[PDB]
Amino acid sequence: CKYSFKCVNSLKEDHNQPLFGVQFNWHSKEGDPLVFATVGSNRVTLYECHSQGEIRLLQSYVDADADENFYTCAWTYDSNTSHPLLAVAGSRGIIRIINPITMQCIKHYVGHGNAINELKFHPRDPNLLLSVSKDHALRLWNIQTDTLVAIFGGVEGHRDEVLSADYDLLGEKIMSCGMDHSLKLWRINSKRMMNAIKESYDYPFISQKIHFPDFSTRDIHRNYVDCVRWLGDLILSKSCENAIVCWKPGKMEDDIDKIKPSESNVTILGRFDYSQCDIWYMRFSMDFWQKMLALGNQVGKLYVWDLEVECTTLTHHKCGAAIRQTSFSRDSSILIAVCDDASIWRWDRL
Amino acid sequence: SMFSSNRQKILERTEILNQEWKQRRIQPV
Ligand SMILES: Cc1ncccc1-c1cnc(NCc2c(F)ccc3c2CCO3)n2cnnc12
Ligand SMILES: [Cl-]
Ligand SMILES: [Cl-]
Ligand SMILES: [Cl-]
C-alpha cells in the first residue's frame, strides 16, 4: 500500500470510559486549525491538531445526566451565521445541538423511543440531520425550523435496531442497516420527499411516515450489520465476519437509479479482509476523496486500504485496546483513532 | 470497467462538494 503513517502522539481522557466516536470537522476552511470531537460516557471533547504532533485540548461538554452514554456525533454549520455546530446523541435517545465555541447545549430533540446509534448531516443542506435508532426507525430532522421531516420505518422498515446509515455523495438517497441483517435504501430525491423537505422550511408540523424502502436485501450478511457507507454507486458494509463487503443492488450492469423496490438480486464485488474485529459496534471510515478506507480492530491495530487499487497496518506497542472509530482530517494528512480504554492516537501521513 | 466508472463518479461528485466547500467561510471553533 502506497500510504504510510507515523504515530506522533497519544493521550487518555481522564473519565477512563470507552470512546465510541470521533469526527474531524470537515467544514473548517483552509488556513484554520484542524479540529476533532471525541464522544464517550456523558462527555463530548474537542481538540485542535498542531505541529510536532500536538493534540491541544480545547474544552469539554459534560451532560447533566451522569447515566447518558454518547455513541455518535456529527458536525454541521449554521447557514445564517456561518458558525460551526456539533450534534451528539446516545443511550438516552436525545439529540443535543452543541455550540462548539462555548461547548454548551443550545437545543435538544426528543422523539426516538430508544438509544440513537448514529447521526449524519446531509452533504448539501447543513440543516438536515439523520438519526438512526434502537427503536427500528430512522428520522430526518430540519434543525433550522426544529421539525421532524420524516420517519423511515413501519410496515417494511427495519424489524430490529438500526445501527448505521449513510447519505450518498450528492444527498439523493440513504442506505441504512441493522440487527435484522438487512440493508435498506431510502430515496430522498423522490417528489414526495423533496416536497416534505420544502414544507419543513415553510413551517404541529406533520411528519412524513415512510413505511416502504426503495430497495431491501438480507443477502449480503448473515448476521447484524453495524456499519454501512456509500462508495460512489457501490456500498461498503460490515458484520462480524472480519470483512467489509463491497456490493451493489441488482445485477452487475444495473444502474442504481433504475433499481425497482421489488429488485431481488444483489451483486457482491469483493471483500476487504482483516482480523480480530468480530465484536459488535466497530465502525470503518473513509477520507473525503474516498481514496482511503480505515478500520480499527479489538487489539488496537489500524488497517488502511488504498481504494484506488482495483493494506497498511498501523500498530503501536502501547495501543492494545479496541479502536471503535477513526477519522481522517479533510486533507487526509492526519488519522485519529479512539479506543475502549479512553485513549486517542494521532497518526500523521508521510 | 465497473471500478473505473465508479471511480469517475466519485471524482466528479467529490469535486462538486469540494467546490461548494471552497465557496464557504465557516468560522473556526
Ligand atoms: C454501550 C456499549 N458498551 C460496550 C461496547 C459497545 C457499546 C455501544 C457502543 N456503540 C453503540 N452504538 C454506536 C455504534 C453503532 F451503532 C455501530 C457501530 C459503532 C458504534 C460505535 C463504534 O462503532 N452502542 C449501542 N448500544 N451499545 C453500544
Ligand atoms: Cl462529522
Ligand atoms: Cl409510505
Ligand atoms: Cl459478512
Determine the distance separating the centroid of ligand 1 and the alpha carbon of B16, expressed in angstroms: 33
DSSP secondary structure code for residue A265 in this structure: -
CB contact under 8 A, B28 and A123: no
Query: Three cell numbers at A311?
Result: 493494506
Instruction: Say if CB A315 and CB A348 are below 8 A apart.
Output: no
Among protein residues, the one whose CA lies closest to atom 20 of ligand 1: A281
How far is it, in rounded angstroms, from Cα A120 to Cα A100? 17
- The C-alpha cell 466528479 sits at B12
Instruction: Assign residue A193 a region (left: φ > 0; alpha: ψ between -120 and 50; beta: otherwise).
Output: alpha
Q: How far apart are CA A127 and CA A246, in angstroms?
A: 30
* Closest residue by Cα to residue A8 from A51, A41, A46, A39: A51
Q: Residue A43: which residues within 8 A CB-CB, separation 6 or more?
A: A13, A15, A17, A60, A61, A62, A63, A70
Residue A130 near residue A144, CB atoms below 8 Å: no
Q: Is the separation of the CB atoms in A177 and A225 below 8 Å? A: yes
> What helix, strand, coil percent values describe chain A, rounded to 5?
5, 45, 50
3-state secondary structure (DSSP) of residue A63: coil
Query: Contact at 8 Å (CB) between B27 and A82?
Result: yes
Q: What gap in Å lies between CA A200 and CA A107, rounded to an integer?
A: 18
Strand (E) or helix (H) holding B13: helix B2-23
- The domain segmentation of chain A, as residue ranges, is 1-350
The span from the CA of A175 to the CA of A116, in Å, is 16
> What type of residue sits at position A304?
V
Q: How was this structure determined?
A: X-ray
Given a contact cutoff of 8 angstroms between Cβ atoms, the answer to whether A314 and A7 are in contact is: yes
Residues with CB under 6 A from ligand 1: A 20, 69, 71-72, 115, 117-118, 163-164, 226-227, 281-283, 324-325
Q: Using an 8 Å Cβ cutoff, are A326 and A294 in contact?
A: yes
E strand or H helix at A339: strand A334-339
**CB burial string A58-82: b at 16+ within 10 A, e below:** bebbebeeeebbbbbbbbbbbeeee
The domain total for chain B is: 1
Grid coordinates belonging to A302 = 489500524
Q: Cell numbers 423496490 label which residue? A: A261
Domain that holds residue B6: 1-29
Is the CB of residue A114 less than 8 Å from the CB of residue A100?
Answer: no
Q: After which residues is chain A broken (C to N over 2.5 A)?
A: 203, 310
Please indicate whether, in this complex, the C-beta atoms of B28 and A124 are within 8 angstroms of each other: no
Q: Any chain B CB within 8 A of the CB of A310? A: yes
CA A165/CA A308 separation, integer angstroms: 24
Is residue A120 within 8 Å of residue A130, measured between CB atoms?
A: yes
Q: Which residues of A221-251 are buried (b: 16+ CB within 10 A; e: fewer)?
A: beebbbbbbbbbbbbbbbbbeebbbbbbbbe
